[PDB]
Amino acid sequence: FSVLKKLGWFFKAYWLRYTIAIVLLLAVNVIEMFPPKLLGNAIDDMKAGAFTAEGLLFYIGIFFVLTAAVYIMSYFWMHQLFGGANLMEKILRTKLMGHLLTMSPPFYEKNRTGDLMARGTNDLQAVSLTTGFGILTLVDSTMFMMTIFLTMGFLISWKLTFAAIIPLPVMAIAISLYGSKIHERFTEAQNAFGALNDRVLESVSGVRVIRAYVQETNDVRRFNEMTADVYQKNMKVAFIDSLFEPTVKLLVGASYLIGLGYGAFLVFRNELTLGELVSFNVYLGMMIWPMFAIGELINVMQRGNASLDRVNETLSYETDVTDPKQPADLKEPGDIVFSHVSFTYPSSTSDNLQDISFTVRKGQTVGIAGKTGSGKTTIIKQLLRQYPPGEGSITFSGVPIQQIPLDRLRGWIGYVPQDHLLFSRTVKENILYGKQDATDKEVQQAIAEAHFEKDLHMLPSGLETMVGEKGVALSGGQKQRISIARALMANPEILILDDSLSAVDAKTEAAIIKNIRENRKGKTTFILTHRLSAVEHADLILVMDGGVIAERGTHQELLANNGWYREQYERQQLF
Amino acid sequence: MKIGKTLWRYALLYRKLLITAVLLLTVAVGAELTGPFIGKKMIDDHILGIEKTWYEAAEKDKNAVQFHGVSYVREDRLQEPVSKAKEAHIYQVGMAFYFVDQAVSFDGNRTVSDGKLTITNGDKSRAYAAEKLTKQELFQFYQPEIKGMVLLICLYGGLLVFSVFFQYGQHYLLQMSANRIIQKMRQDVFSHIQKMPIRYFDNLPAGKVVARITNDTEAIRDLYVTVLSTFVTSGIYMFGIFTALFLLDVKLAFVCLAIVPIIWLWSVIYRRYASYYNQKIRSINSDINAKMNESIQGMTIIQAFRHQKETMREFEELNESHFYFQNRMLNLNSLMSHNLVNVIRNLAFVCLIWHFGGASLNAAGIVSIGVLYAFVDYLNRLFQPITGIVNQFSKLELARVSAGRVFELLEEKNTEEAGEPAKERALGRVEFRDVSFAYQEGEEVLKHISFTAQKGETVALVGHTGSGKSSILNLLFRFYDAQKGDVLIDGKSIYNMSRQELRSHMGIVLQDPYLFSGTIGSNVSLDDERMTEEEIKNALRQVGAEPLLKKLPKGINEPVIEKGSTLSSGERQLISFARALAFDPAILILDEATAHIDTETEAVIQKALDVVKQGRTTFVIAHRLSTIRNADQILVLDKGEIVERGNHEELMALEGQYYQMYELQKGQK
Numbered sequence A: 001f002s003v004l005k006k007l008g009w010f011f012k013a014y015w016l017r018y019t020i021a022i023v024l025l026l027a028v029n030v031i032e033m034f035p036p037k038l039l040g041n042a043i044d045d046m047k048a049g050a051f052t053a054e055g056l057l058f059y060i061g062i063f064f065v066l067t068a069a070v071y072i073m074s075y076f077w078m079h080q081l082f083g084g085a086n087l088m089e090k091i092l093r094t095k096l097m098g099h100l101l102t103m104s105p106p107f108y109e110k111n112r113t114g115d116l117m118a119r120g121t122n123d124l125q126a127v128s129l130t131t132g133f134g135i136l137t138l139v140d141s142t143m144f145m146m147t148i149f150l151t152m153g154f155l156i157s158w159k160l161t162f163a164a165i166i167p168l169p170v171m172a173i174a175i176s177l178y179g180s181k182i183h184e185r186f187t188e189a190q191n192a193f194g195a196l197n198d199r200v201l202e203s204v205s206g207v208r209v210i211r212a213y214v215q216e217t218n219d220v221r222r223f224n225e226m227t228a229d230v231y232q233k234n235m236k237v238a239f240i241d242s243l244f245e246p247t248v249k250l251l252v253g254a255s256y257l258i259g260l261g262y263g264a265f266l267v268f269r270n271e272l273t274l275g276e277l278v279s280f281n282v283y284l285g286m287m288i289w290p291m292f293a294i295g296e297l298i299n300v301m302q303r304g305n306a307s308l309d310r311v312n313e314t315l316s317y318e319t320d321v322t323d324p325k326q327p328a329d330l331k332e333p334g335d336i337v338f339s340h341v342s343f344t345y346p347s348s349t350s351d352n353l354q355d356i357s358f359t360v361r362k363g364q365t366v367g368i369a370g371k372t373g374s375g376k377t378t379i380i381k382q383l384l385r386q387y388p389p390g391e392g393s394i395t396f397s398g399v400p401i402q403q404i405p406l407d408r409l410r411g412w413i414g415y416v417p418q419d420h421l422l423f424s425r426t427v428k429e430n431i432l433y434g435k436q437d438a439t440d441k442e443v444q445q446a447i448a449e450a451h452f453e454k455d456l457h458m459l460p461s462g463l464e465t466m467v468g469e470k471g472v473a474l475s476g477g478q479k480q481r482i483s484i485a486r487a488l489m490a491n492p493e494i495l496i497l498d499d500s501l502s503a504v505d506a507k508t509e510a511a512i513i514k515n516i517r518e519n520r521k522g523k524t525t526f527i528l529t530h531r532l533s534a535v536e537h538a539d540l541i542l543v544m545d546g547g548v549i550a551e552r553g554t555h556q557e558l559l560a561n562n563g564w565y566r567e568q569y570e571r572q573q574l575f
Numbered sequence B: 001m002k003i004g005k006t007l008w009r010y011a012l013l014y015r016k017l018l019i020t021a022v023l024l025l026t027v028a029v030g031a032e033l034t035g036p037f038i039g040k041k042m043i044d045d046h047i048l049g050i051e052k053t054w055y056e057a058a059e060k061d062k063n064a065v066q067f068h069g070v071s072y073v074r075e076d077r078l079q080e081p082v083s084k085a086k087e088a089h090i091y092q093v094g095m096a097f098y099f100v101d102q103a104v105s106f107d108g109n110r111t112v113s114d115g116k117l118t119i120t121n122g123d124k125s126r127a128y129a130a131e132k133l134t135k136q137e138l139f140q141f142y143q144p145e146i147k148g149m150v151l152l153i154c155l156y157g158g159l160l161v162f163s164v165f166f167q168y169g170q171h172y173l174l175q176m177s178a179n180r181i182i183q184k185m186r187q188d189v190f191s192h193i194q195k196m197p198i199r200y201f202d203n204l205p206a207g208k209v210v211a212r213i214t215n216d217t218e219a220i221r222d223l224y225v226t227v228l229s230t231f232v233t234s235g236i237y238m239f240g241i242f243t244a245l246f247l248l249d250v251k252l253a254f255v256c257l258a259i260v261p262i263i264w265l266w267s268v269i270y271r272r273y274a275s276y277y278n279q280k281i282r283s284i285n286s287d288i289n290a291k292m293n294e295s296i297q298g299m300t301i302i303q304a305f306r307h308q309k310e311t312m313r314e315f316e317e318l319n320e321s322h323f324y325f326q327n328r329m330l331n332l333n334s335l336m337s338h339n340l341v342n343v344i345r346n347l348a349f350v351c352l353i354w355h356f357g358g359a360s361l362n363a364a365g366i367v368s369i370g371v372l373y374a375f376v377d378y379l380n381r382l383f384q385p386i387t388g389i390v391n392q393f394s395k396l397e398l399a400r401v402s403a404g405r406v407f408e409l410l411e412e413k414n415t416e417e418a419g420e421p422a423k424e425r426a427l428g429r430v431e432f433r434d435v436s437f438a439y440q441e442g443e444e445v446l447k448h449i450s451f452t453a454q455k456g457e458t459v460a461l462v463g464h465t466g467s468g469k470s471s472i473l474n475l476l477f478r479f480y481d482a483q484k485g486d487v488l489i490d491g492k493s494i495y496n497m498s499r500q501e502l503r504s505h506m507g508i509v510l511q512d513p514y515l516f517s518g519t520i521g522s523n524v525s526l527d528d529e530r531m532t533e534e535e536i537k538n539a540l541r542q543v544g545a546e547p548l549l550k551k552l553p554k555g556i557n558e559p560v561i562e563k564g565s566t567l568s569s570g571e572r573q574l575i576s577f578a579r580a581l582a583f584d585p586a587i588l589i590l591d592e593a594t595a596h597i598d599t600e601t602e603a604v605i606q607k608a609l610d611v612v613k614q615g616r617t618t619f620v621i622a623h624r625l626s627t628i629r630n631a632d633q634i635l636v637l638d639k640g641e642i643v644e645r646g647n648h649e650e651l652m653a654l655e656g657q658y659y660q661m662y663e664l665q666k667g668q669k
């Protein structure tokens, strides 16, 4: 099977468990075959009055021992087989999460966050049944079928056994075709689960927008359409799933008629003994169950093949940014010099950065300004290594950025995103992301360097205030100051303030800027702002116009160069 | 019982499909059960039927077979004389048939004839005679049986072929009904979630609500397909077995009925445990989803601050708990499964042996052994159905737990009613009267808010971070109800109007823009109202987004990824601003709209606003005092209280917080 060939990696790791399970299963088969013969012997001995007192105390004891043995060994092999299915879920979930944690935005642009969740909570459930109930049914039905085939071939006859088997190949081909189609149908249906998850997420993450504009009616209708689409793709699987039972029943009933007819003909020609045919009919009656078992098996295996295929598709996404195999032993970054950097985003077609070249010397504070959609944050992202490296080069003290392990580089850089990102924890927990093993005094210092003590006094529980999901239980400026404290906690070599003063009033903005000027003295800083009062201290100011540095220099020359910088300066201060 | 009495209602809704499925299932089960009995009839009447008495009759009996010049007739194919001549039995010792033409016999005991068939049953073994029938005479004897089989096998073939459709129809209808019920459940849950207040969403992870809709509804399907099918099939099988048992015995089928209580008791013992674990499992599942959504949406920060190890450790705890509780269900599914029913079967055999073993001392049962073969066969057939249903308890309990988790959400008492959009455009008279608000009990975030906005004016809200301006916006939109005071649109209080009408009176630009999936035009238009492309383009040009369009190939048709990840924050803000301006709202509310937008585009936006702000009330919450420099009245908030108000000249003429903030914003030069 494709699913088993794909799970061979796990089956090899866990071989003793399944070996024990199979051995116990075969043993249980035999130890269950015995009770029928024992009871038959007991009843036969009860006929002529030969059943004595010893017979009772022997039959009762042997039946009790048989019951206890079957119970214990069955418990054990069901523990081993099914117990190995849960390990499927655990291992696959761990692998999936560990893969997601090392994935860059380019991966997340293509893969929706609703689809991924369905790939770790539902696909695993589909795949789990393959190694548990799937393996049990396979081996159990195979042993039962082989026992029926062998007993009919040695006890009764061979011609009859080869007679009531002709239907079986046709059943095999039919079930194989149905499984092949059900694989595609179930792959299509499973994706409709990710779409439903995404639809539910969007209607929840953006509830405020929907309710403010009164789009509830147009939101319920879209969800109803999505549910109808999901239902349609489920029926396309039902139309094939329902064919597994009728086919098996028909092609076993044909076997029954063939066997009975051939047996009657052989009896008429005097090849049978008239007691062989009754036993043969009894044996034929048993054949039905393994066929239903194999049909259910083929149905289940394909249900897990599609989900495993999706999980493997997720897990086979090579990293966009690769940690160097032979890194550089650089300890601290001295000079960040861009040289003819040309970078275009994956989904774009126009060069977002075009021939960028500037130098940031150790300790210098660099400001980047420009109209909306110019490329300011693209440089910061070039430093952060979120997307595959573009052209040109970015050398950290003469060593290209590529030949530096991501852990060290990330430790160097303290990032403040332009879009606030917070988790559902206490304020202190969020602030400690920069330095988990940090004393309360360090947190207090970081807070006081972001002009946030007054808010802490104002807040209900102070540092122990649970911020709602995404921080919805805080003001925008409070989120910004929490992010600034997070960045400043680690005391990063390079501090990236990407529009970190946007919802911070004017007094709070002045205070934070003064603190930064007195905190990053002699350290590297990238300040991105639309207000030009936060870049007055910068040694190098870069004006970005459509992916190209239109102007450069400090405040004085940019003022003396007229153009965009002087225009904005005059419109922002002389007002 | 909410869980039991509710799943019935959903089944009752689609009662036509389910009733048809049950009828098809019953017919298919009846046909399948009958089949083997047709086979048994064929056997016992056509291939084993050359064993009963062959009365010695003459010709002209409508059926007769020549044998050594004398034609005999079978017992049943014979007409109705009484004891015509004698009984000429047939017996098949070894593998060949031997004719008994001498006289009658008794209960047979096969023994080699050697010309004299010895029937050693008791003592009467006369060794009558024997004559091998060769092969041609046997075929002559069997020809009418050939006719019978050929006319009876086709009956089995017909019953088989005409019963193929019923199985497919039953299964397809069951699955269709299950899918329809899941669809209805999801739609109802989504409607209710649309009917819940914002407090519910603010302190609940988005992954815990998606789980209750999608994850917790997939697990209820099995309750209607596999469980129902298996229960119906087993019920029919056991009814057949029991009615069969009662006919051939009494006081021995009554004891067999003791199986019915035991299973019930078994279920009661299983449920009590399978419940507790299942709940936990389900709960943990939700958490995992949350952890998969919280982490994915914030992966950039997790990687930037090297929090991967802790996040994986945080995730691994939930995975380990889920795995542990699944293992705890392994023990229950192992103790109460096929095993226990096989334990009872052996116990039943032991009880039968002990009871009849104590009766075989006097050989009582052997004389009455006519009720032993049938009883043992029926007892063995009894446990095949039972093993079918006991395996359905796990699915039943999982479905019950999932249904309960869905219904506890569907039955939430807290809920806000709904109305219809506004019928008449509002003049634009917005008034706050003595409004006091507190997000958390005992903590007033706004204290005695009082002001009035007239049509054609521009009320600007200013203050330090955390003052409570966005709280004023929340109260105006009735996301959060006030606690003391009133809010009036025109002269009507906003609490006597439907929320949909109030929110239709105004269009807002939220502090943090949100972009839905689809094209930019979709976000600007939200797929409602009159989405004329020219109007959308006009709004985009008004907001100053024109460059963004000429930097994109398809313009307003450019696809927008989830959350607009491929758009700069300023571009997202411009798109949201255009969305707000495209509805031509009576009251326009801006909540720090120009926060990530440069000064050039900000000036363009202000120019666009001024042109059509002579007949539209506007609320501006801005930390950039330049945009509200020329406003009808500015209000300064401090700790949730309005301390200063008036025109800009009035505010500057009295110094104060606004004066200080404006001077700081103004060039220190």
Ligand SMILES: CCCCCCCC/C=C\CCCCCCCC(=O)O[C@@H](COC(=O)CCCCCCCCCCCCCCC)COP(=O)([O-])OCC[N+](C)(C)C
Residues within 6 Å of the ligand: A013, A014, A015, A016, A017, A018, A020, A027, A065, A068, A069, A072, A073, A076
């Ligand atoms: C007749 C046939 C049965 C004969 C039984 C003989 C006695 C045996 C008794 C006891 C021996 C116990 C040995 C302990 C070993 C523990 C460690 C271990 O290997 O565990 C393994 C499980 O292994 C088991 O748990 C085996 C269970 C055997 C059950 C036997 C039932 C017999 C009942 C008889 C009833 C008679 C009633 C009589 C009348 C009252 C761990 O699994 P694994 O595969 O390692 O998984 C991880 C793999 N990895 C490490 C690579 C990651």
Ligand SMILES: CCCCCCCC/C=C\CCCCCCCC(=O)O[C@@H](COC(=O)CCCCCCCCCCCCCCC)COP(=O)([O-])OCC[N+](C)(C)C
Residues within 6 Å of the ligand: A174, A239, A243, A246, A247, A250, B016, B017, B020, B164, B165, B166, B168, B169, B170, B172
């Ligand atoms: C429901 C009435 C009461 C309620 C009324 C009020 C509600 C009315 C609402 C909705 C009702 C919708 C119809 C459902 C009712 C069943 C009939 C039917 O047409 O449905 C389907 C099932 O039908 C069957 O299964 C019937 C038996 C024939 C089966 C033929 C294929 C398998 C044959 C055995 C081969 C075995 C192998 C043999 C060996 C190789 C018909 O099939 P389909 O493909 O789903 O139909 C296509 C249409 N579709 C594209 C839109 C999906």
Ligand SMILES: CCOc1ccc(-c2nc3ccc(-c4nc5ccc(N6CCN(C)CC6)cc5[nH]4)cc3[nH]2)cc1
Residues within 6 Å of the ligand: A028, A029, A032, A033, A036, A140, A144, A278, A279, A282, A283, B338
């Ligand atoms: C001579 C004319 O009379 C005959 C009398 C009896 C038999 C006969 N031969 C048999 C051989 C196998 C079985 C059988 N009994 C079993 C019980 C349980 C299991 N399983 C499957 C389910 N899992 C959970 C446990 C193991 C398979 C089993 N296989 C019974 C049998 N009955 C044949 C002809």
Ligand SMILES: Nc1ncnc2c1ncn2[C@@H]1O[C@H](COP(=O)(O)OP(=O)(O)OP(=O)(O)O)[C@@H](O)[C@H]1O
Residues within 6 Å of the ligand: A345, A346, A347, A348, A352, A370, A371, A372, A373, A374, A375, A376, A377, A378, A379, A418, B551, B565, B566, B567, B568, B569, B570, B571, B596
């Ligand atoms: N992931 C992305 N894929 C493709 N294009 C992108 C992506 N992110 C941004 N862009 C586009 O690239 C251009 C530059 O965006 P960038 O975010 O670098 O601008 P910015 O100067 O930081 O903007 P703002 O002032 O709004 O913060 C814009 O057209 C933006 O839409």
Ligand SMILES: [Mg+2]
Residues within 6 Å of the ligand: A376, A377, A418, A498, A499, B568, B569
């Ligand atoms: Mg930016």
Ligand SMILES: [Mg+2]
Residues within 6 Å of the ligand: A475, A476, B470, B511
């Ligand atoms: Mg706010």
